[PDB]
A paper describes a structure:
Poxvirus encoded M2 protein is a member of the poxvirus immune evasion family and plays roles in host immunomodulation via the regulation of innate immune response mediated by the NF-κB pathway and adaptive immune response mediated by B7 ligands. Here we reveal that MPXV M2, co-existing as a hexamer and a heptamer, recognizes human B7.1 and B7.2 (hB7.1/2) with high avidities. The binding of oligomeric MPXV M2 interrupts the interactions of hB7.1/2 with CD28 and CTLA4 and subverts T cell activation mediated by B7.1/2 costimulatory signals. Cryo-EM structures of M2 in complex with hB7.1/2 show that M2 binds to the shallow concave face of hB7.1/2 and displays sterically competition with CD28 and CTLA4 for the binding to hB7.1/2.
We finally determined three complex structures, M2-hB7.1 hexamer, M2-hB7.2 hexamer, and M2-hB7.2 heptamer, at an overall resolution of 3.04, 2.7, and 3.12 Å, respectively. We could not obtain a three-dimensional reconstruction of the M2-hB7.1 heptamer complex, partially due to the few cryo-EM particles of this complex on the cryo-EM grids. The resulting structures reveal that M2 forms an oligomeric ring structure with B7 proteins binding to the outer face of the M2 ring in a 1:1 stoichiometry. Structural analysis reveals that M2 interacts with hB7.1 and hB7.2 similarly. The interfaces of the two complex structures have very similar atomic contacts and bury a total accessible surface area of 1760 and 1617 Å2, respectively. M2 binds to hB7.1/2 side-by-side via β-strand complementation mediated by the C-terminal half of the M2 β11 and the N-terminal part of the hB7.1/2 G strand. The long C-terminal loop of M2 sits on top of the shallow concave surface, formed by the natural twist of strands G, F, C, and C’ of hB7.1/2. Extensive residues from the C-terminal loop, β8-β9 loop, and β10-β11 loop, and to a lesser extent, the β8, β9, β10, and β11 strands form a network of both van der Waals and hydrogen bonding interactions with residues from strands G, F, C, and C’ of hB7.1/2. Specifically, residues E122, K123, F126, K127, R128, and E133 from hB7.1, and residues M120, R122, Q125 as well as N127 from hB7.2 form hydrogen bonds with corresponding residues of M2 protein. There is a total of 12 residues on GFCC’ strands as well as CC’- and FG-loops of hB7.1 reside in the CTLA4-hB7.1 interface; however, 8 of them are also contacted by M2.
Author numbering:
A (entry chain J), E (entry chain L), F (entry chain K), H (entry chain G), J (entry chain H), L (entry chain I): 35 to 140
B (entry chain D), C (entry chain C), D (entry chain B), G (entry chain A), I (entry chain F), K (entry chain E): 20 to 220
The structure:
């Protein structure tokens, strides 16, 4: 678990720690969620996104499959778990559940 | 001097939260039934096997090359047909991940031979695998959170029993498979969740 | 992978409404008696046979070349001596009509050897036949509505049990014979109808 | 197809009033005792035999060459020591008179060997005879009204049982003998008459 | 059973349907009774008679062992059973229980 | 099941889908009934008919053993089942239970 | 035809007052004890023997060459240590006096071998004798009134039982012996007398 | 039992019906009693007597061991039993219990 | 004719106060316990032996060359640890003194082998001796008053039982030994004395 | 038991009936007691004495081991038991329990 | 004559406070549980061994070359997981110190083979040693106060039982070992201390 | 047990009765406590001391491992137990529990 700390109202990268290839990205489902509340999904190459986090997150796939949180707020503080699944034998096999915690200093 | 496992007892009062097993099913289960779950435990050649039958599912979970034997189990039914299984062993003598094989046979509805029979790597620390075999099409999703940090809040521990759970993130391993496009909805709503302690512990 | 039938259980909670069997009798039955019906089930070489004795009738119904075994039965007495039998199996694995043989022996009144012993073609889709044999002159009419769309409204399903019924007209088959000029008065008045669950299920 | 007799049952609910047997005795019986009468029935080679022991009398009645077996009996005590026996069989398959042999042994008072051992012709239609043998001097009169038109008004039929009685004068046969100058006072006063159902039916 | 019907205030024969000889009549007990209420007895050749029916019945033994009811009334309407017994082995053996019903038209 | 739809106050054929011969019609019992309430019977060649539907139905035996509903009304809307039985071994054997549903547009 | 004795029964309801046996004892008995008397009966080669043990006395009374077997007994304690025994058989088939042998062994106090062992002639009609043998010195007087005209007024007959007693002076026989100068004070005061029915009848 | 009847105020013999010899009378106890109330005793040749019957009874041993009741009264009416015992094996053996009943006509 | 002893019974109601046995002990007994005393009796070759275990003492008392067998015993605890034993036999057939042997083994406290094993002459009439053997040091004093004139006033005799005691000074014999300088303080204070009847009598 | 009777206010000997020698008297414990209330003790040759009976009793050992009661009173009436024990095997063996009763005539 | 040990009994009422055994454990015990302790006693070749299992500990204490056998035990749980064991034997026949061997196996938590297996000399008078063997790492401290002067104030002695304890400092021996730096905190707080009597005494 | 008695306000030696060497003193834990209330500890050569007894006790190790109580008071009266443990097999083995009682006379 990576306790990344970062100052308020700043671009905030959250590393998933798992590298997926762009050919494999169509067959791999990636989604981020904090405190069991969903944040963004990348289901079969579709970058769907939640209304709480539509306009302030940018997915950088190459840099450890990360989200960059723009204009970070204390409401965004918490534990983000990054979930990655791969399609095997007509079943999505979960392969990554890395948890990172973001703390807000103001 | 080396720490060992004690000889087996009729009743165990020191329970260790080893695994949070959640199985989603397509057939309907309404709510928790008292006395439904019947579990059988066996510790043979350092392998702890528990076979619990309840709510139309027979779950055969085996932990391999381990120094702890199972003591108890608790099965509860959540909303949207999610079935939550809480499993308990003696104590955590060694701080290492163990290879698991969990066989989930549908015994009452959507009944058949082996459907998946594959290996789920643990997502955290990648040190163990679940050789999971499903005999039937009833199972929709399986989430096995081993050595969980958080005990389910509406699990009422039996009196004169003592619960210990792992408090380290370095020890918890999650095994997950979903057979339908469910986005891991194995996460129960937990609003109407109740837990019943199994028989033959 | 192919869907199979589960191994038999002592008690089954997933019931499927397979057949609405109505038998009219000339001898008098007043009303439903609790604990009257005693049923025995056997699944041998893909054939589901149920033998239920109640209200002076022994009904031996066999479904041939099927993947479902009987689970339960319910026998009720209607007005004008109509006897309504609700039959239940595990689940509908295959969506095909099955050949049936139903043997209805009068064991208490108007008692004798085989009276009809004939084949009733199913009136809808004409894909199955009932080899129906009546040992006695007590039976006035037989109506066998297999895979019924509508469950009888005053059949109280037992608690902790789950009822599923066919909702497709393409699957319901009606077998009918009337031995007197009755214009198919097997249709019960249903006003005073009650249902009792059979024993040895 | 020919109408037959059903295989025997533990409990029969369809009773047919076959015979009104009245036996007068010189020794004193006060009133009806609940559970006094113990009857045993046997249907061997188309012969229905009933042996009922009660109130100091063992009555062995056998109906020969018949298609009906006995189901039940009821013994009651009237005023002036008259003993009324109501007998029941399955149903009247054939409308013919049958030869009877009724053996009435006094087992408690006025006790001895065979006293009469004679044949009573039936008074109506003269088609049958009662080979009646009395082992003792206790019996004062015997009136056997077979297939009676009228059921005794203060015989309470058991619940969940169905009574049928013959309604034709062409079928009722009366067998009568009186050993004292009694002018056939076997006719009970019926004022204090009660009936108790026999055991081992 | 013979449903004999006959008009009010008339001589009324009621047939027993059993013929007994006069030598056998001393050994044979004959009695008539309607609705279990006794009418006349011929016990060992003694023609005893009940106060309700003393003066209006005449026994004709030869004509089927009958009673003739004189001045018949609706009170006499009912079912008459005729009972005949013969002495065998120190016991009176009943041999006839023929029932006839008389109806009164007025 | 045939969902025949037809406009209000019009002649309305309801096909049974079973063809019987006129020699067999004397031995075959045909009756129509909607919502378990009986409509017409053709028992042994006798075209008996119910008071609700006396004057507005005509049986056409040849055209798939049909009824023609005259001046159709929304009360006639419902599911009509057509029941045909044949006499075999002193028993009427049911051979047809075709259901058709009539809908009324007004 | 000859009147016989019936085969033995478990319970007899027709009792005949055969004998009023009164035994005076020197040792103290206070009052009647419920369930004290235990009687055993045997009818072997036309001899009716009854052996009743109660209140420190074993009384073995045998009636020889008789057609009646004992049915019951009743033992009561009177004032001045008089013990009254009421004895019952089936019925009086023959109107003749029978030779009796009554053996009265003291089993609890004043205990020894045979003390009298003599023959008491019956005082009325002189047709029978009592071969009476006393094993002990406890017995003070014996009065045996056989076939008594008068039943003891404070003997409560059991319900559903029927008592018959001899009403002829030509049939009653009195056997009497007094071992002390007592002037036949076997006559009880009867003021506090109660009777208890014996066991093993 | 002898029902001896005799008129009021008269000598009244009551027969015991048992004859004892005068040598045997010393070894034989004789006593009379009515309604279990004692009347006279002859114990070992001693003719003891009760205050109710002191002066009106005379024992005649030879004439069937009788009492003669003088001036008989209705109070003397009742059943008299006569009891005779003989000494055998250190025990008085009862040998006579004849009962006679006296009735008083006035 | 000679007076004998009766055959043994399950329950005896005629008790004879044969001996007042008082045993003082150094170890503490608080008060009488209901059901504590368990006695066993045996009459072999005219010797009456009673073995009663209670309050830490097993007392084996044997009366030699006697015609009376023991019937009952009663053990009570007095103040200053005095233990009072009341003993009962059938009856006193012979008026002679009998030689006794009483063995008092301490079974719970101050436990050992034979300590005294000597003969106590009876102090009154000097006609008998007590061969008394004590297995242990627990016993402080023994007073055995045989055939006592006075029954202990707070001994409640059981109902339906009859007590007889000797009333002659010529028959009472006292056996006494004191092992400490106690001046025969075996005499109980009797203020808090209660008596419990022994078991297996 | 000796019922010795003696007049009031007189010297009163009470015989024990047991003779002990003066050599044996040191090894023998003798004590008198009436109604379980102790009177005098002679324990190992020590003539101890109770306050009720200090000045009116004299022990005469030779004359059957007696007490002589001086100025006898009705309070002294009762049953006196005389108890003698001898030392055997470290235990005092009781050998005499003779009871005498004194009655007072006044 | 020499004082011996009595033969064994089913129930003993004379208890002697022989040892105050206190065992501290690292695993959590909340409070005293009624019926938890199960003890087994054996006296073989003058060696008194007691094996009591309770609260996750099996304690096998053997006293060698002794004349007293164990009678009872009482186990209670104090604050800070201190476990207090009170042990009882028959009586103290000899006033000498005895060599002891106490084996304390952890049977439920912190479970393993022999950890210490050493000899503790008694600190007072140095006349005896405790060969103490611990099978596990659960035990933190052991304090064995043999023949204690003071009984624990909140130990409720059972009724009808008698407690005796040593009152001499010359007889009490203390055996102590602490495996952690605890400064002998085996001394319980005794505030919430309760005691339960063991089973199989 | 040594009952040492000593007058109030005086130096007061309390003997432990166990002699330990100064090389062994580092491996031996000695502590004194009265009525289960701790007084002083000598844990691994560190002479720690309780606030009740800081300034009035002096440990003399050589003279039987004693404490000297200065200005003794009746509050110091009681039973002092002296506890000595030695390190054996990674366990402190208790070897001395001598109890002495101090009494204060004033």
């Amino acid at each position: 678990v990576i306790h990344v700390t970062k100052e308020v109202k700043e671009v905030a990268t959250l590393s998933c720690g798992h590298n997926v290839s762009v050919e494999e990205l169509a067959q791999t489902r990636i989604y981020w969620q904090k405190e069991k509340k969903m944040v963004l999904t990348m289901m079969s190459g579709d970058m769907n996104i939640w209304p709480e986090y539509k306009n302030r997150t940018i997915f950088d796939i190459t840099n450890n499959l990360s989200i960059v949180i723009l204009a970070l707020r204390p409401s965004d503080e918490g534990t983000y778990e990054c979930v990655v699944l791969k399609y095997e034998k007509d079943a999505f096999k979960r392969e990554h559940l890395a948890e990172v915690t973001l703390s807000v200093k103001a | 001097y080396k720490n060992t496992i004690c000889p087996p007892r009729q009743d165990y009062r020191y329970w260790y939260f080893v695994a949070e097993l959640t199985i989603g099913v397509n057939y309907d289960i309404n709510s928790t039934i008292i006395g439904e779950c019947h579990m059988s435990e066996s510790y043979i050649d350092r392998n702890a096997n528990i076979v619990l039958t309840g709510y139309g599912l027979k779950i055969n979970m085996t932990i391999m090359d381990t120094d702890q034997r199972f003591v108890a189990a608790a099965e509860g039914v959540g909303k949207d047909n999610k079935l939550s299984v809480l499993l308990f062993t003696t104590q955590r003598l060694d701080k290492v991940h163990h290879n698991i094989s969990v066989t989930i046979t549908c015994m009452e509805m959507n009944c058949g031979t082996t459907k998946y029979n594959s290996d789920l790597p643990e997502s955290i620390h990648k040190s163990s695998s679940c050789d999971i075999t499903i005999n039937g099409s009833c199972v929709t999703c399986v989430n096995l959170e081993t050595d969980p940090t958080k005990i389910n809040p509406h699990y009422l521990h039996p009196k004169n029993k003592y619960l210990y759970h792992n408090s380290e993130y370095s020890m918890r391993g999650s095994y997950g498979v979903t057979f339908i496009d469910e986005l891991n909805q194995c996460l129960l709503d937990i609003k109407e969740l109740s837990y019943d302690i199994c028989y033959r512990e």
